[PDB]
């Protein structure tokens, strides 16, 4: 009740956390090629301002 | 090892090359012939040190440790034949070869001469043991326990490559433990703390702590056929000796932060003993015992200053024979009752009177009967940590009191009446059941005659 | 930009808590702007007031945690003994994480919010103290 | 058809030779321009509309991946005008150089460029041809090298293994499982490249061999994960051990040879006192094995081979140079005293 | 990577359409032709890692030859030296 | 590093050479001995000690390749050491001539327990 | 036929054999009506190799040499025992339809490979279209259930992609349920009291299911009578020989046609069935269960271990 | 000069959201060849005044591949419309 619970709390959170965050990466990418390519120009505009990329 | 790995690799093109059922009697026959060659060229003298040949062997000079590594392969083949003989011959021979391959990396290991060959051999295991858990095991929930058998040892061991190459490019070269004469001291910083941290934490993955040890009653609970690689998993846990190699030098003076490793392994020591008096599994029963007085040795090392290296040399092999023998008791009484749950075993001691002697002397090695190899080292752990302070005898002494109940808690379970059942479990302890049950105490009390070889530098 | 971080480690040093978190909320105010860009382009077409994205308020979360990210330092770095210490700067990790615990309610999310956010905070001033470099060169 | 099927296949490697053999920015323009024109009919052959609805997504991506490169090329024409393949003399150009070039070596941005292409192609025969597009732009980066902004190149690499370690937890399509982890090794050999561009190709060679063996072992019958249940007791039990011999090596365990570059990757990376960055990558590479375990648990444990249909007939595939491939892919970790001397 | 087949076997793939002053088929030079012939002479045996720290000078006037940058900056401010004093005289010069 | 596009130059004539009967040349092809057995094991031989011509020339492959591979490998460390010594020999300020002192000057920390 | 890329570039087999001697032909037949009365007879003089109807051991009648191995390895649902058709059983009666439809493509693939082998016509008893005539009586007489109908019907949409259909496809002269009297007069002791729910449903399925294949531009030869009886023999021999070339080919659908230009209908119509492992390669079963077609992992999955007698019959050393 | 600043904004008709989106998919491929001639001219500015005389082949050989790349992707959109009749880039079935 402590040894297989409150030691089963912290490390099986890690697998559930990654499986939560592996679910937000594929299921939001179901086609819609209009929505792909507007995000690639977001990548090419954020690279100008943000950092040492022009200096 | 001039030619020790050399004869045993030739044993491998002999399994599938051989005939039919002759493969068991042939494999055991060759195997004991190497055991004399182990004894002969070793055990030499002896005064600092025996650098063996070259860059691949330092001859295990300070701690011999290697005789115990070679009993087990001509000891488990007679054990694994209990329930294995149901498959194809080519599939059964593969199960023979992978266990023999397990010994060859561990033959080069424990001597290893170096540190960059150490880690590749420190990680050369876990490949054959994992396959044994996957195929030809027991019932389900194997595969998660195979994943818990990974993802801890590999999780902690990867900063060693972060540590060691950081030493190799900084001060000299770690090929030679004996070219470690010049060692700079290590002061308290915020960078050097992590340098000691990665140097130590990977060794706590194998010999367990009160933390991070949930995987250990999975491989021993969900286990192969009848304690087959479980006996090898005993040497796999005690074989984390390399802290003796490393932290003897290479930041010795950081003891200001030794305390949370002293304390956590001490209240967790007294706790995990009592965490199994209400356990309902036999193979889990010895498993939590194998945590407690294996966690005894850790405070013998981080506390330096010998009269602590004396007993800690002997306490590695203490349960290493004992818990291997207890698993041989637990591998038996399962081919006859096909469930490992201890409560169903009421009404013993009358059908099997011959092995009833073997229950007595085995559990008499936990009470441990002070002229043995067990209470000869635990008195030196007393002799060390009482010089630390006067409080340390309290929590360590109750460990000698809880396992007094916890061992006889198993013995009394054999004595009951009328047994209610069991038109099966007829077999009155055949030759394989008791000859394999021997050869454990038979060298153990033999080593208690002149226990001079079981001693470190020290 | 790297002018913001150049204005961070030089002047305040725990003191000047009026302008400490005024330089520290700007990174937290800019951090939600990046995830707001993908929340309209990766998440589907929103209501007729784009940006009208799925949950919204991502900047409304990010600018608040970045505000208290410097505030909990310059209070505690002022009142305890006046250095910036790993024990001192640890305190900003816990309560700053619990805005993400207060919003999107707790017991499974906010319970780990004080947990992970504190340890990664204390390494930062530990990182500048021992002379560590992430992107070095010979 | 069968005459020109070699001829189309011949000109692909003819493209990447010209990429390697030139001192001129306009020939390396032409180089993987004609490659992008030579890949299209390989996608088509059976004329299925899904293959057409995959190549055109592949098309207009790599069209921009061409056409953005030339915009960098005219800048150092206006800036000192020399056309030797060297430093670009403008950080505004070197920015435009790399993050256009990284499309064809698809990084953590340009997400669905890899899986949406490789899934949906009926030609699972190969489709090992997407190792050539991993080979050609690496043969430019060895020469772009001593003028990069040094932060952009490492940022794409840390993100590279971060998304690739996450993508196959949500997968059954073993093409997409092999479409992912192709981002993984393309983060490492970029992350070396500021520190000793030699031994980058050591990561490149090992990745070719361990991907060449993977699809040739996939050209038995399997295209779906549960289709890899029905071959041990149906097709051949000998394939069941050999597929376990590679999926565990490519995870990178030290007794096999898949670990061998990652052994050497730190000896180069430290000694230049970057410590926090290799630790974050090696701990991420732990997740690279939980693709393979949880996949190897299906084929090597006899997970219900149903659908009674017995193959009493023999097999005649074209296992061309196959059995000699997993002999340097397992037992070569002792056999590299100096791979960084013949290659470097 | 750069295998350089054309170094051993002595033909040029191109190697001519490379710099500003190589071939010039009827000996017709370029505008900044005189600075290529100097800037190459500076760093030839140099291994390019000290060239950005040793030569450093013949690259500059060459780069400013290609743009005439500060010349355009110097010439534009003449329209502020004079030509704010338009009604304040100073025709300078009278024709022709 | 000059005279490019060479497998191994004609400057590599001062090599011992890295001759035969080393365990590596034994090992290169020792796996090839295991390799041809797998070629039987794929196509249902079922012999596993099959026809000798398929059992051989895996051996002939690796052994000639491995000896022809090791010739530049010892050359490459040699030319790596050939460049290093002169730069060591030059720049005496970049290679300090340190003075050795015995264990009578060192007063280390000192930390006992 | 096509034998690798290297033999295809010298001498192709695209149009060198089919000098109107291909003539892909079949019949359908009914129960005990067109087995061997006229279907076996049309071999002379036109040179048409006959193939049989069905059987469990058709995969056992190949791979050598050659003798049929028993039904324990070739596990089906026991021909001449499924006439009891136990609609409540273990079972499964659809496992018979697993193996019977499996050899159906193998009879269909061995025929068309022989055209590019020699160039003779091949008659067929019951082609890939005839199994759906069983399905109507399989569905109405309740010895099938749902989630078994859609399994092979998915596969029948899958397994046919490159196949050129036959040409003068004959519906044989079938009586008006006089096969209800042929079912007892011709012996057949296991063909028993299964009623008109099986008999009329297949008889309804000839104009309800075979009619779309009858409406092919490849013209059909329809008869419905007692038998041929030397009146439809020459009418399906002489008047089929004049109706196989001239007034026969409208869209023509089958000739190893205009993609015989070293193209799809010449090389990839022979390389799809030669060494027939690719034809039962998409014939591996459904996703998880399908409730009938199941063999377990080790019981009865260990049935392959008894059939694991050396895994190759005999092949000796040195060659 | 200002003749380089415009045309340089004219290169930013390769706006990617108007390069693959929205439907009437020919309007997408429209600006792709429209991204050409923003590079044919911009190169031909600097090649021409700075009298190079050798890189005149470079903008000519640019337009050779510029139509040839544009020739390929136009063919595939017919193969899109071969089974459909309209382009309509909101067509999506094959997902990632
Ligand atoms: C038909 C008739 C046939 C006639 C037969 C011949 C007649 C009998 C032979 C005469 C006696 C020899 C037998 C040995 C026993 C007596 C030894 C002795 O006291 O003399 C000292 C004498 C010592 O020699 P030493 O010249 O005085 O000095 C040399 C050393 O420096 C001295 O110092 P140390 O280094 O030896 O240290 C002392 C100690 C230390 O030795 C050890 O304990 C080391 C051994 C364990 C090491 C750990 C191994 C772990 C693996 O040695 C002992 O253990 C002595 C205890 C008794 C022997 C142990 C028996 C083991 C069984 O002999 C020995 O101790 C040698 C030990 C060898 C043991 C052999 C055992 C043979 C048993 C045969 C089976 C008999 C079964 C009978 C059953 C009957 C029904 C119940
Ligand atoms: C006529 C030109 C034919 C070129 C064919 C190219 C085929 C495509 C090759 C792609 C894979 C490249 C793998 C790189 C390692 C190849 C082995 C090798 O080192 O040979 C290069 C060798 C060694 O190169 P090198 O020592 O002469 O100088 C080049 C140095 N590198 C390779 C680092 C750029 O080149 C030869 O001289 C060929 C012998
Ligand atoms: C070396 C350059 C050769 C250039 C040849 C360009 C083709 C010129 C027209 C060739 C017509 C030849 C007429 C005589 C052949 C009679 C028909 C015949 O037997 O077909 C067999 C054919 C002759 O080809 P074919 O052109 O006559 O008809 C084949 C049908 N197509 C074109 C659709 C493939 O032999 C072959 O299969 C090999 C030729 C393949 C197609 C040509 C590409 C390679 C050209 C050779 C290099
Ligand atoms: C969390 C990772 C913590 C690492 C912090 C950064 C450590 C660092 O920068 O290196 C410290 C130091 C080298 O750096 P430096 O301080 O400059 O010393 C002079 C040499 N340049 O000296 C060192 O190299 C120390 C090397 C050991 C520290 C790296 C390993 C520490 C992490 C191990 C903790 C346990 C594993 C946790 C992760 C696995 C579980 C998920
Ligand atoms: C005697 C050899 C074994 C008997 C003949 C081989 C028959 C066979 O094909 O079995 C292959 C078997 C693979 O196992 P599996 O596929 O699961 O089951 C099939 C069982 N028929 O097992 C295998 O043989 C796989 C091959 C293992 C890897 C190649 C090793 C070749 C071994 C023969 C040479 C012996 C010397 C090699 C070892 C040297 C060690 C120093």
Q: Return the HEC string of H9-71.
A: HHHCCCCHHHCCCCCCCHHHHHHHHHHCCCCHHHHHHHHHHCCCCCCCHHHHHHHHHHHHHHH
Contact between chains at B162 and D255 (C-beta distance less than 8 A)? no
Relative orientation angle of helices D49-73 and D27-34, to the nearest 10 degrees: 170
Distance separating alpha carbons of residues B192 and B182, to the nearest angstrom? 18
Radius of gyration of chain D (CA): 21
DSSP 8-class letter at D228 = G
Closest to H66 measured CA to CA, from F48, E42, D37, D130: D37
Kindly tell me the burial class for residue B49, based on how many C-beta atoms sit within 10 Å of its own C-beta (0-12, 13-18, 19 or more): middle
Distance separating alpha carbons of residues C45 and B364, to the nearest angstrom? 75
- Nearest residue in F to E8, CA atom: F5
Closest to D318 measured CA to CA, from D193, D219, D183: D219
Is residue B348 helix, strand or coil? strand
Q: Which two tokens stand for residue F95?
A: 């290679």
Distance separating alpha carbons of residues G19 and G311, to the nearest angstrom? 43
Scan residues 117-136 of C and list those with Cβ closer than 8 Å to D: 132-136
DSSP string, chain G: ---HHHHHTTS--SSSS-SS------B---TTTSSSSSTTTBTBTTTEE------GGGTTS-SSS-PPP-TTTS----TTTGGG--SSSSS-THHHHHHHHHHHHHHHHHHHHHHTTT--EE--SS-TTSHHHHHHHHHHSSS--TTSHHHHHHHHHHS-SSPPP-SS-EEP---SSTHHHHHHHT--SSS-S--HHHHHHHHHHHHHTSHHHHTSSS--EE--SS--TTTSTTTTTHHHHTTTTGGG-SS---SS-TTTTTSTTTTTTTTTTSSTTSTTSS-S--SS--SSS---SSTTTTHHHHT-SSSSS---TT-
Q: Which residues line ligand 3 (CB under 6 A)?
A: D 3; G 261-262
Relative orientation angle of helices A33-49 and C17-41, to the nearest 10 degrees: 150
Closest to C104 measured CA to CA, from C50, C73, C58: C58
Q: Which two tokens stand for residue G236?
A: 């399906």
Distance of CA D28 to the CA centre of its chain: 21
Which residue, by CA, sits nearest to atom 2 of ligand 2? E5
Length of chain E: 96
Q: Which two tokens stand for residue B430?
A: 């055949």
Degrees (nearest 5) of the Cα angle D333, D334, D339? 70
Closest to G103 measured CA to CA, from G43, G157, G137, G62: G62
Q: How far is the CA of B368 from the centre of ligand 1 (A)?
A: 25
Distance linking the first and last C-alpha atoms of chain H: 46
Answer whether B267's CB lies under 8 Å from B295's CB: no
Contact between chains at C112 and A38 (C-beta distance less than 8 A)? no
Answer whether B100's CB lies under 8 Å from B8's CB: yes
**Which residues does chain A have within 8 Å of residue C38's beta carbon, measured at their own beta carbons?**
39, 42
What are the residues whose beta carbons fall under 8 Å from the beta carbon of B174, sequence distance 6 or more?
A: B114, B115, B116, B164, B167, B168, B180
Chain C touching partners, 3 or more CB pairs below 8 A: A, B, D
Q: How was this structure determined?
A: cryo-EM
Distance separating alpha carbons of residues D162 and B320, to the nearest angstrom? 42
Q: Which two tokens stand for residue E66?
A: 């290609």
Length of chain H: 96
Chain A touching partners, 3 or more CB pairs below 8 A: B, C, D, H
Answer whether B308's CB lies under 8 Å from B380's CB: yes
Look at the alpha carbons of F5, F9, F11, F16 in this order and tell me if their dihedral is positive or negative: positive
Across D18-56, b (16+ Cβ under 10 Å) vs e yields bbbbbbbbbbbbbbbbbbbbbbbebbeeeeeeebbbbbb
Q: Answer left, alpha or beta for residue C91, where phi above 0 means left and psi between -120 and 50 means alpha.
A: alpha
Distance linking the first and last C-alpha atoms of chain G: 27
Using the structure block, give the residue that is written with the tokens 């933390």. B211
Kindly tell me the burial class for residue C131, based on how many C-beta atoms sit within 10 Å of its own C-beta (0-12, 13-18, 19 or more): exposed
Length of chain B: 458
Q: How far is the CA of G113 from the centre of ligand 4 (A)?
A: 68
DSSP 8-class letter at B414 = G
Using the structure block, give the residue that is written with the tokens 């790599």. D62
* Cα atoms in the 13 Å half-sphere on the side-chain side of G116: 26
Domain H2-84 coded CATH 2.30.110.10: no
What are the residues whose beta carbons fall under 8 Å from the beta carbon of G59, sequence distance 6 or more?
A: D310, D312, G74, G102, G103, G106
Closest to B289 measured CA to CA, from B281, C10, G75, B391: B281
The secondary element (H helix, E strand) that includes residue D31 is helix D27-34
Answer whether B362's CB lies under 8 Å from B411's CB: no
Is residue E95 helix, strand or coil? coil
What are the residues whose beta carbons fall under 8 Å from the beta carbon of G145, sequence distance 6 or more?
A: none
State which ligand 3 atom lies nearest to the alpha carbon of G9: 37
Distance separating alpha carbons of residues C25 and C71, to the nearest angstrom? 9
Distance of CA G277 to the CA centre of its chain: 17
Substitution site in B449, B451, B454 for ligand 1 pocket (most atoms within 8 Å of beta carbon)? B449
Look at the alpha carbons of B274, B275, B278, B281 in this order and tell me if their dihedral is positive or negative: negative
Distance separating alpha carbons of residues F64 and B37, to the nearest angstrom? 38
The secondary element (H helix, E strand) that includes residue B322 is helix B309-331
Q: Which two tokens stand for residue C136?
A: 């070095």
Closest to B295 measured CA to CA, from B274, B270, B276: B270
Q: Which two tokens stand for residue G173?
A: 């002269």
Distance separating alpha carbons of residues B228 and B137, to the nearest angstrom? 10
* Cα atoms in the 13 Å half-sphere on the side-chain side of G260: 17
Distance separating alpha carbons of residues C69 and C73, to the nearest angstrom? 7
Distances (CA, A) of H94 to A29, A33, D121, G131: 11, 11, 10, 34
Ligand approaching nearest to the C-alpha of D135: 2
Between chain B and chain D, the number of residue pairs with CB atoms below 8 A apart is 50
Distances (CA, A) of G74 to G57, G96, G143, G303: 8, 11, 22, 10
Answer whether D66's CB lies under 8 Å from D36's CB: yes
Q: Three-class SS string for C98-134?
A: CHHHHCCCCCCCCCCHHHHHHHHHHHHHHHCCCCCCC
Distances (CA, A) of B264 to B258, B270, B393, C8: 11, 10, 16, 40
Distance separating alpha carbons of residues B221 and B240, to the nearest angstrom? 21
Length of chain D: 344
Distances (CA, A) of B38 to B3, B41, B56, B60, B324: 10, 6, 17, 12, 21
Alpha helices in chain E (DSSP H): 5-8, 33-42, 51-54, 58-67, 69-76, 78-81
Q: Which two tokens stand for residue G278?
A: 């690719």
* Cα atoms in the 13 Å half-sphere on the side-chain side of B61: 15
Degrees (nearest 5) of the Cα angle B417, B418, B424? 120
- Nearest residue in B to F110, CA atom: B185
Phi first, then psi: what are they for B262, rounded to 5°?
Answer: -70, -50
Closest to G110 measured CA to CA, from D313, F80, D145: D313
Beta bridge partners of G44: G42
Distance of CA D62 to the CA centre of its chain: 16
Q: Which residues line ligand 2 (CB under 6 A)?
A: D 17, 135, 201, 343; E 1-3, 5; F 4-7
Answer whether B178's CB lies under 8 Å from B49's CB: yes
Q: How far is the CA of F48 from the centre of ligand 5 (A)?
A: 7
Dihedral, B281, B284, B290, B291 alpha carbons, nearest 10 = -120
Dihedral, B398, B404, B406, B407 alpha carbons, nearest 10 = 150
Phi first, then psi: what are they for D4, rounded to 5°?
Answer: -80, -10
Substitution site in E3, E6, E9 for ligand 2 pocket (most atoms within 8 Å of beta carbon)? E3
Q: How far is the CA of D3 from the centre of ligand 3 (A)?
A: 10
Kindly tell me the burial class for residue D260, based on how many C-beta atoms sit within 10 Å of its own C-beta (0-12, 13-18, 19 or more): buried
Kindly tell me the burial class for residue B342, based on how many C-beta atoms sit within 10 Å of its own C-beta (0-12, 13-18, 19 or more): buried
Answer whether G137's CB lies under 8 Å from G201's CB: yes
Kindly tell me the burial class for residue B427, based on how many C-beta atoms sit within 10 Å of its own C-beta (0-12, 13-18, 19 or more): exposed
Closest to B95 measured CA to CA, from G206, B87, D17, E43: B87
Is residue D224 helix, strand or coil? strand
DSSP string, G195-245: -HHHHHHHHHHHHHTSHHHHTSSS--EE--SS--TTTSTTTTTHHHHTTTT
- Secondary structure percentages of chain B, helix, strand, coil, to 5: 50, 0, 45
State which ligand 3 atom lies nearest to the alpha carbon of G12: 37
- Secondary structure percentages of chain E, helix, strand, coil, to 5: 40, 0, 60
Which residue, by CA, sits nearest to atom 8 of ligand 4? D275
Distance from CA of A35 to the nearest CA of C (A): 6
Closest to D152 measured CA to CA, from A38, H17, A44, E1: A44
Is the CB of D149 inside 8 Å of chain C's CB atoms?
A: no
Look at the alpha carbons of G48, G54, G59, G62 in this order and tell me if their dihedral is positive or negative: negative
Q: How far is the CA of E3 from the centre of ligand 2 (A)?
A: 5
List chain H domain ranges.
2-84
Is residue D173 helix, strand or coil? strand
Radius of gyration of chain E (CA): 22
DSSP string, B30-67: HHTHHHHHHHHHSS---SS----SSTT--TT-S----S
């Amino acid at each position: 009740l402590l040894d297989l619970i409150w030691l089963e709390a912290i490390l099986p959170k890690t697998i559930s956390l990654a499986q939560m965050k592996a679910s937000t990466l594929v299921t939001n990418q179901k086609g819609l090629i209009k929505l792909y390519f507007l995000s690639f120009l977001i990548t090419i505009l954020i690279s100008m301002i943000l950092f040492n990329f022009h200096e | 090892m001039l030619k020790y790995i050399i004869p045993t690799i030739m044993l491998m093109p002999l399994t599938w090359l051989s005939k039919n059922n002759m493969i068991w009697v042939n494999s055991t026959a060759h195997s004991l012939l190497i055991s004399f060659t182990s004894l002969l060229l070793m055990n030499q003298f002896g005064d600092n040190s025996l650098n063996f040949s070259l860059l691949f062997f330092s001859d295990s000079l300070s701690t011999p440790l290697l005789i115990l590594t070679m009993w087990l392969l001509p000891l488990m083949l007679m054990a694994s034949q209990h329930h294995l003989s149901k498959e194809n011959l080519t599939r059964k021979k593969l199960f023979i070869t992978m266990l023999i391959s397990l010994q060859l990396f561990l033959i080069m290991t424990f001597t290893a001469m170096e540190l960059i060959l150490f880690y590749i051999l420190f990680e050369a295991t876990l490949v054959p043991t994992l396959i044994i858990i996957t195929r030809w095991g027991n019932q389900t929930e194997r595969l998660n326990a195979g994943l818990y058998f990974l993802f801890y040892t590999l999780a902690g061991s990867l900063p060693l490559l972060v540590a060691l190459i950081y030493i190799q490019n900084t001060v000299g070269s770690l090929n030679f433990l004996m070219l470690q004469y010049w060692v700079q001291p290590v002061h308290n910083s915020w960078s050097n703390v992590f340098m000691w941290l990665a140097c130590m934490m990977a060794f706590m993955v194998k010999m367990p702590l009160y933390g991070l040890h949930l995987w250990l009653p999975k491989a021993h609970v969900e286990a192969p056929i009848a304690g087959s690689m479980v006996l090898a998993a005993v040497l796999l846990k005690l074989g984390g000796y390399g802290m003796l190699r490393i932290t003897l030098i290479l930041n010795p003076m950081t003891d200001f932060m030794a305390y949370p490793f002293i304390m956590l392994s001490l209240w967790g020591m007294i706790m995990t003993s009592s965490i199994c008096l209400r356990q309902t599994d036999l193979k889990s029963l010895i498993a939590y015992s194998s945590v407690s007085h294996m966690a005894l040795v850790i405070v013998a090392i981080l506390i330096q200053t010998p009269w602590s290296y004396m007993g800690a040399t002997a306490l590695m092999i203490a349960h290493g024979l004992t818990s291997s023998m207890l698993f041989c008791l637990a591998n038996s009484n399962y081919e006859r009752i096909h469930s490992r749950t201890m409560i169903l075993a009421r009404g013993l001691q009358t059908l099997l009177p011959l092995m009833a002697t073997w229950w007595l002397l085995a559990s008499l090695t936990n009470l441990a009967l002070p002229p043995t190899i067990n209470l000869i080292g635990e008195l030196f752990v007393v002799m060390s940590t009482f010089s630390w302070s006067n409080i340390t005898i309290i929590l360590m002494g109750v460990n000698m009191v809880i396992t007094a109940l916890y061992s006889l808690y198993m013995l009394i379970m054999t004595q009951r009446g009328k047994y209610t059942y069991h038109i099966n479990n007829i077999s009155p302890s055949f030759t394989r059941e008791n000859a394999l049950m021997s050869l454990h105490i038979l060298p153990l009390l033999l080593l208690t005659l002149n226990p001079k070889i079981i001693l470190g530098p020290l | 930009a790297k002018t913001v971080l150049r204005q961070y480690w030089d002047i305040p040093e725990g003191t000047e808590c009026h302008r400490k978190t005024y330089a520290t909320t700007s990174i937290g105010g800019a951090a939600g702007l990046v995830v707001s860009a993908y929340s309209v382009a990766l998440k589907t077409p929103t209501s007729f007031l784009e940006g009208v994205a799925r949950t919204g308020r991502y900047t409304f979360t990010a600018a608040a945690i970045g505000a208290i990210f410097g505030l909990t330092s310059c209070i505690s770095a002022q009142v305890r003994e006046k250095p910036d210490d790993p024990l001192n700067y640890l305190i900003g990790g816990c309560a700053g994480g619990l805005i993400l615990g207060a919003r999107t309610r707790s017991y499974g999310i906010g319970a780990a919010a004080c947990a992970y956010m504190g340890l990664t905070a204390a390494l930062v001033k530990m990182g500048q103290l021992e002379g560590w470099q992430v992107f070095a060169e010979p | 058809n069968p005459i020109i099927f070699i001829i189309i296949l011949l000109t692909i490697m003819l493209g990447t030779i010209i990429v390697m053999i030139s001192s001129h920015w306009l020939l390396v323009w032409i180089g993987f321009e004609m490659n992008m024109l030579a890949i299209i009919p390989i996608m088509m052959k059976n004329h299925n509309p899904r293959a057409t609805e995959a190549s055109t997504k592949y098309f207009l991506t790599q069209s921009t991946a061409s056409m953005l490169l030339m915009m960098a090329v005219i800048i150092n024409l206006m800036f000192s005008g020399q056309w030797t393949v060297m430093k670009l003399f403008n950080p505004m150009a070197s920015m435009l150089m790399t993050m256009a070039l990284a499309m064809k070596l698809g990084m953590a941005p340009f997400h669905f460029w890899v899986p949406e292409v490789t899934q949906g192609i009926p030609l699972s025969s190969g489709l090992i041809l997407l190792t050539w597009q991993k080979l050609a732009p690496m043969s430019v980066l060895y020469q772009i090298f001593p003028s990069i902004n040094l932060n952009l190149i490492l940022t794409l690499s840390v993100l590279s293994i971060l998304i690739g370690g996450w993508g196959g937890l949500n997968q059954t399509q073993l093409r997409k499982i092999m479409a992912y982890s192709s981002i993984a090794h393309m983060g490492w050999m970029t992350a070396v490249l500021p520190y000793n561009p030699t031994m980058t190709l050591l990561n490149l060679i090992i990745y070719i061999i361990m991907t060449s063996t993977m699809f040739t072992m996939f050209m038995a019958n399997s295209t779906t994960t549960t289709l890899s249940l029905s071959h041990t007791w149906n097709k051949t039990p000998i394939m069941t051990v050999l597929i376990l011999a590679t999926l565990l090596s490519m995870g990178g365990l030290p007794p096999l040879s898949g670990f061998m570059p990652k052994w050497m990757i730190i000896q180069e990376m430290t000694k230049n006192n970057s410590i926090i960055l290799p630790t974050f990558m090696a701990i991420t590479a732990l997740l690279n094995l939980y693709f393979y375990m949880r996949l190897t648990y299906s084929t090597t444990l006899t997970m219900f081979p149903s659908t009674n249909n017995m193959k009493m007939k023999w097999q005649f595939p074209l296992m061309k140079k196959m059995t000699f491939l997993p002999t340097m892919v397992v037992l070569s970790t002792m056999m590299l005293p100096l791979t960084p001397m013949l290659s470097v | 990577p750069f295998f350089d087949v054309q170094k051993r076997l002595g033909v040029d793939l191109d190697r001519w359409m490379t710099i500003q002053s190589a071939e010039q088929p009827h000996k017709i030079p370029s505008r900044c032709h005189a600075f290529e012939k100097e800037w190459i002479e500076c760093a030839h045996g140099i291994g390019s890692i000290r060239a950005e720290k040793e030569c450093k000078i013949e690259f500059e006037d060459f780069r400013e030859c290609l743009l005439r940058q500060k010349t355009m900056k110097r010439l534009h401010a003449i329209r502020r030296q004079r030509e704010k004093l338009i009604k304040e005289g100073k025709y300078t010069p009278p024709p022709h | 590093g000059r005279a490019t596009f060479q497998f191994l130059p004609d400057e590599a004539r001062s090599l011992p050479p890295p001759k035969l009967t080393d365990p590596r040349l034994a090992f290169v092809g020792f796996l090839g001995y295991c390799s041809g057995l797998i070629d039987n094991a794929i196509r249902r031989r079922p012999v596993l000690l099959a026809g000798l011509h398929r059992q051989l020339l895996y051996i002939t492959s690796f052994v000639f390749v491995g000896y022809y591979l090791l010739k530049r490998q010892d050359y490459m460390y040699a030319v790596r050491d050939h460049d290093m010594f002169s730069y060591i020999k030059s720049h005496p300020e970049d290679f300090p001539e340190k003075d050795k002192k015995t264990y009578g000057e060192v007063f280390e920390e000192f930390h006992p327990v | 036929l096509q034998y690798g890329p290297l033999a295809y570039i010298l001498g192709e087999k695209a149009t060198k054999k089919m000098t109107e001697k291909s003539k892909l032909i079949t019949v359908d037949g009914n129960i005990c009506s067109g087995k061997s009365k006229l279907a076996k007879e049309i071999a002379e003089k036109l040179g048409l190799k006959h193939f049989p109807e069905a059987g469990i051991h058709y995969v056992d009648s190949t791979t050598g040499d050659g003798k049929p191995l028993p039904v324990q390895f070739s596990g089906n649902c026991s021909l001449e025992k499924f006439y009891d058709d136990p609609k409540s059983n273990d079972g499964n009666s659809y496992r018979l339809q697993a193996w019977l439809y499996a050899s159906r493509l193998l009879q269909y693939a061995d025929a068309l490979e022989h055209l590019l082998s020699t160039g003779q016509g091949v008659v067929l008893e019951r082609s890939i279209y005839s199994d759906f005539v069983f399905l109507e009586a399989m569905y109405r007489q309740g010895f099938i259930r749902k989630q078994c109908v859609d399994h092979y019907n998915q596969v029948k949409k899958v397994t046919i992609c490159e196949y050129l259909p036959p040409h003068v496809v004959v519906y044989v002269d079938v009586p008006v349920p006089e096969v209800q009297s042929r079912i007892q007069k011709k012996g057949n002791p296991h063909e028993m009291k299964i009623t008109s729910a099986y008999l009329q449903d297949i008889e309804n399925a000839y104009k309800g299911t075979f009619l779309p294949e009858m409406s092919e531009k490849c013209e059909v030869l329809q008869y419905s009578a007692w038998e041929a009886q030397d009146a439809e023999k020459v009418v399906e021999d002489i008047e089929y020989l004049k109706y196989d070339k001239g007034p026969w080919l409208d869209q023509n659908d089958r000739n190893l046609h205009k993609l015989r230009m070293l193209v799809q209908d010449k090389l990839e119509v022979l390389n799809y069935t030669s060494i027939p492992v690719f034809l039962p390669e998409v014939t591996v079963g459904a996703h998880q269960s399908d409730q009938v077609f199941q063999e377990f992992t080790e019981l009865p999955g260990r049935k392959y271990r008894a059939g694991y007698n050396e895994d190759v019959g005999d092949k000796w050393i040195w060659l | 000069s200002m003749v380089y600043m415009n045309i340089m904004m004219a290169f930013t008709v390769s706006l990617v959201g108007l390069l693959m989106y929205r439907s009437h998919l020919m309007s997408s491929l429209l600006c792709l060849e429209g991204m050409m001639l923003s590079l044919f001219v911009m190169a031909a500015l600097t090649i021409l005044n700075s009298h190079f005389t050798l890189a005149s082949m470079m903008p000519i050989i640019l337009l050779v591949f510029a139509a040839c790349e544009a020739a390929l992707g136009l063919s595939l959109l017919v193969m899109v419309s071969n089974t459909y009749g309209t382009d309509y880039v909101q067509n999506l079935n094959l997902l990632q």
